[PDB]
Amino acid sequence: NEGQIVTLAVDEIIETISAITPMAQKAKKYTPPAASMQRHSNTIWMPVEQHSPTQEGWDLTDKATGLLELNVAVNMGEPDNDFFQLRADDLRDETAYRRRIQSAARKLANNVELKVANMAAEMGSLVITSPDAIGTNTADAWNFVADAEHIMFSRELNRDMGTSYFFNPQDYKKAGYDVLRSPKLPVLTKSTATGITVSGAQSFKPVAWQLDNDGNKVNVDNRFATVTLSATTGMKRGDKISFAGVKFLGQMAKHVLAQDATFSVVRVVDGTHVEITPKPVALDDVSLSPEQRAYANVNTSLADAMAVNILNVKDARTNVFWADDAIRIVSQPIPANHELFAGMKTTSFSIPDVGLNGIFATQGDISTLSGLCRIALWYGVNATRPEAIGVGLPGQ
Amino acid sequence: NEGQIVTLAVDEIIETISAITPMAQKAKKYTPPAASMQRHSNTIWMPVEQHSPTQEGWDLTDKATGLLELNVAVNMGEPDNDFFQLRADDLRDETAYRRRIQSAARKLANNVELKVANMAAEMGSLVITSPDAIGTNTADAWNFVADAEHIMFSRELNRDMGTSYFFNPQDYKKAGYDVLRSPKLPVLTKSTATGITVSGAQSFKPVAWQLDNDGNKVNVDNRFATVTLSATTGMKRGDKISFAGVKFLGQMAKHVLAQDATFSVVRVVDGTHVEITPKPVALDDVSLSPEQRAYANVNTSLADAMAVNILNVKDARTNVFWADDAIRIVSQPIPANHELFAGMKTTSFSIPDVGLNGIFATQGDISTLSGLCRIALWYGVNATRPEAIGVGLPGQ
Amino acid sequence: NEGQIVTLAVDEIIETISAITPMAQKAKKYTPPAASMQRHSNTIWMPVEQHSPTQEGWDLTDKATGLLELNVAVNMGEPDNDFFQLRADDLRDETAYRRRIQSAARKLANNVELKVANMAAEMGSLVITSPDAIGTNTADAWNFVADAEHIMFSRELNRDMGTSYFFNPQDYKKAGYDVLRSPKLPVLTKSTATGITVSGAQSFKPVAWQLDNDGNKVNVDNRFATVTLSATTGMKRGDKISFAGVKFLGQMAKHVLAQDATFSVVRVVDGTHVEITPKPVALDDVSLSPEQRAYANVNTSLADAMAVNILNVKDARTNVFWADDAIRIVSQPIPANHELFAGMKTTSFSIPDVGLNGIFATQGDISTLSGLCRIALWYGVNATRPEAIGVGLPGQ
């Protein structure tokens, strides 16, 4: 063994996590600007931009400056980690030793997938439902991919390669067989609410800056917005809803689509308020500036006494899809000091294939005549753009 | 001239801003570890010095586990700009040229002194009052300086480097003449409210973190407490209030002092909620864990049906004082790429004592036969330790 | 950094205790004859000032044989500590590091002042009290400082190095301005007791030793007499009492003074026994040997049917004073463990003027990826002569 141990451990971890994390790829990396950070925590804003049709002419005098930018938050929790004791018969030879560290790495890598897979099904906003099972038979059985293509094309929203679809394993066989399996995809559940309405007519705006209590200006996160209700019994986060008169618009030409608008609920507050996504910015109001109108998705105001209806009417396992760069993974080197305290050999490491970073450490314990071993990965994940994440269901 | 222009421009800017900034010289200089970049600002967090219960004897066991830590916000937008043309008659020779840059730099740097003065006078929490005018050697007169040490020393808030005091120039002569005069100091104003009452018993804790909408954990700054009242009837930010029947505690010794507890209001919400400072943690509340009780400030919880009184019934010019480290100036070097683009010139400067970073840049214009110049300074200030910024209302 | 940490840390702890511990500095340093040893708690005895009868003549025969000697106990408890984990960002660089050692050292320093200040003000036996509040230059107000020489000089309890005085900050302002501020002093509180009376005739004498359970002889500290009364309620420790018709004597001259004798109560037992200070060795008790009578200080035996009265009927912030040598702080160096266990670092240290001693230690802990630090002080403090600590109670 000869004190080499850390080299074999990082060799297993890097190789293993790169192999077994398929759904953590197919999403886009990001970083701090200079890796300089050292505090216990930090908060990052990051930008998003809506594309614009190309100007034609020999030379130009207009629209070079662009339009109003927006930003979204991300925040990093305490690391996911594994913590275990090396009894010496696991340490006796290399091809035995790899077993332990590999099993820990596999136990850890599960959580990196489970977090993103759970997040997409709860937080997403496009919804498709047919009162049918999935099947290959052209008659009297439904096809999921056919509608999931059409609903994005008709919005103008997907304009790039890599649009991806995911199945749960007990459905992946029903459809025969870019498409992938995941075992980790959750179950929704049936909400109990009925007769729900808004009260008082309401409207909303994109905004770049507002005041903080000290008197400075901050960007305001634009993903969700508040709506107020006649009642709020019988609902939970990750449910799915629609407003009776309301329809979506395509991003470029701004025609109305055929089908009704869809919204997704992220918190319930004080028996009175709900936070929902995406923010329902409306066409056909004179109040908006020519910049502000460019972010309208919705045909009307949220009018008084609008009937609110549940779409998730009976419950089953999910299936999920997204356009490229809807979900991001963020990380830093861990704040730690090397070659300072004698009682704790430790090293940093990175996983370039997935953008994670982590730390390995070990210490000898008098209470068990054995080494203790710890591994931790620091990472944060969020949807940047709820408008682009979609969920299908088998019937109700 | 030689093309030397920048060597005169920075000489004027560094010297003139050094001479005209009497108040900003006495906040604490600071730096974050980051290097933020123009399209995405960072809401960088910072810590406050911690406290803990007494812990006694040999064989101490796991008693580190409960220890608690706290933080406060600071925020930054785009920098302040000044931006103007160099006509040719402003550009003949050194003694003519200087004037221009001095006029710009004065117009810029004045904004910083106005910020720190106006923020302190609005936001601070210690209040001192006399019906008398400021004066000396006379029982009809009142002395500011004595009370302005005594009220703060008896709280145990003072450090080793000592306090500082700012008078307005209308009052200053009446006291004759650590102590300075500043022209920029605002008037508070009178407020109409009366018959105000607390609406129901309220209580508070220090807090480590709360949940983000995405499901992560974020630190929460404990500076601002929400309080709910009968109708707020025309209160304003920067006003000053006291509740009946509650008293301050000495920070280390925990004994009660004699005089009424005092609070400052920073924002108003929905006619029945207000944001106030500092957070009123009680000593008599059974409900705190002992590691939380270490932060106590007030003799009782803010009990039901306590009357408010308003400490600002008639108005006069302010005078202001603070303990050391109660105000910070935050700044970062400006990102620009030296000699990346040929068709422009830029250079970087950093004012050594007040700690403001700054950028100078110049450009030609074929459309007007004239050079453009653009100077910018990036900075932000925040009320750390709001428990130790204080304001005096003479002549009330 | 280089793991040199101790050579900075002690050079902050020494200095940052030294500047802020006045009530410790004015106590008098002592030493036992030993060099101290760690594991066991460890009472130590020491002698008071002696007295002996007059003895004229060229011839003395055996008259040294009867000389009577007295001692008192100090009783060192288990140690005083502060104990916390070094986040790593607090260890980046020297000027950022110092602040953490200061933040710990201030909490450590505060506990020493609070001990001696509370002990003196609670236990002490001279009472000065007035129906008026403190003031100056005014016939209808009272000055504390004169009476707090007059009582001591009248007893001839004075000493070469001179007495010393403290005020709380709320009173110190009213005295204008050997004399010191302090934030730390306690509040006494009102006692409900009334009609208290002595249950049977009693008197007292000094004793050198008494029999232990095993049949050996051990010393008795003479300070704490015990008295038995009609039933008592609400006499919490730190209260103050006097007996009708009993007067003090000057220590050397044995002349009777004019004012009432005063006593301070330290525990309650069985609702009908109390412990009180000083032990009232009566002159004109016919039972004493002349070698005992030399310690007498009170005009009569404690006769039957004596009326007690209570000396603190309304409660306000106190203040405190003492003769030289009245308070002793005891400490000595702790044993070192240099390199004895390989997985640890430590050193002893001392604070040369105030006389305290302590130990610094640090450890790397894999449970939190952090260095732990422990700093510990070992000190005991006691009133060596309770006749010489005096307390003010204005406004009765």
Added chain:
Amino acid sequence: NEGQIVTLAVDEIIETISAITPMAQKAKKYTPPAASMQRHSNTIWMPVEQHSPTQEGWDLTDKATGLLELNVAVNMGEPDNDFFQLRADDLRDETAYRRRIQSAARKLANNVELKVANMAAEMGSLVITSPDAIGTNTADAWNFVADAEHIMFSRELNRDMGTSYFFNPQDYKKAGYDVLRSPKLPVLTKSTATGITVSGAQSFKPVAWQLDNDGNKVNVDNRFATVTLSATTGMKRGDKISFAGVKFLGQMAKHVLAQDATFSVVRVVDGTHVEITPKPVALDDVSLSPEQRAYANVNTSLADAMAVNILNVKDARTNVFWADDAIRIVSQPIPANHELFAGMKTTSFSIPDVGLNGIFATQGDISTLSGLCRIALWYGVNATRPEAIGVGLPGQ
């Protein structure tokens, strides 16, 4: 340690006794002339002189050289002692060792102060009485320092070198604030006698010599005098009296004063005789030589049927004053042999600022496993001019 002990002992004793002897150092230091007066006990005569106005004119045979000079006696009693055993822990090192000697020296100094103060107060012959307490009010109290200049200046006794006053510490406070304060001054006490009378006509002379039993000539102790009175009960040493009729004269001009002649009683003999002071040498007697008449004090003989009245009818702590050179302290080197005996160590020392002499001796032991120490001071004190020592009393 190291046998140096005697050096540290005198370094404590010389210092501390010189600091705590405020009264004794106002008496006049005096010595017999010889360097070798080794006899184990002795009585020492000293001459007294009365001042005479400087003469005028070119040559003199008016009175010239031959005069009726007078002597007084002082008798040196046994030394004062202090005598104690050195346990082992009192002899560890210098900073501990100094405490024992310092405490013994203090204890020793107390006798010297108490002796002179008690002697002056009980023996003195001017008396002032007012039926009041001491205080600064205009027409409501008594002003002691006025009367005790008026009474002496009107006798013309203290014409040169001035005077000294002492107050008890309780009266000094009421007088506000040449003048000093001491705890040690005694209480007189009330006496029972009434209706007393002179028993038969008596008169007196100054004298230089009378015959001893063996027909040699000796001086006559010319301060005391004997009177016979009707049978006495309840007279005691140090009482105060005045006869009917008789009035005092000023020394330098023989004018009568208004107030009564006054006297002090030193010893009762057989219930029929008393010794009193000063000796009442009358003017207006023919039985006097022209030199003898110069010493006269009073306006008539002490005739038959003169009534006695008591000037001490109710009692309090005294106050006292004297003209300079009217109390003397006498001392000599102690007779002892050095290195004559090998078993015992001793050395001799002086206290220059008081004129006292003393001896230090230390002796080994077998009886108690210890060292013995014995320090002794030899001195005697007397009212060498009792006409000049005055006493004041508050009312009756």
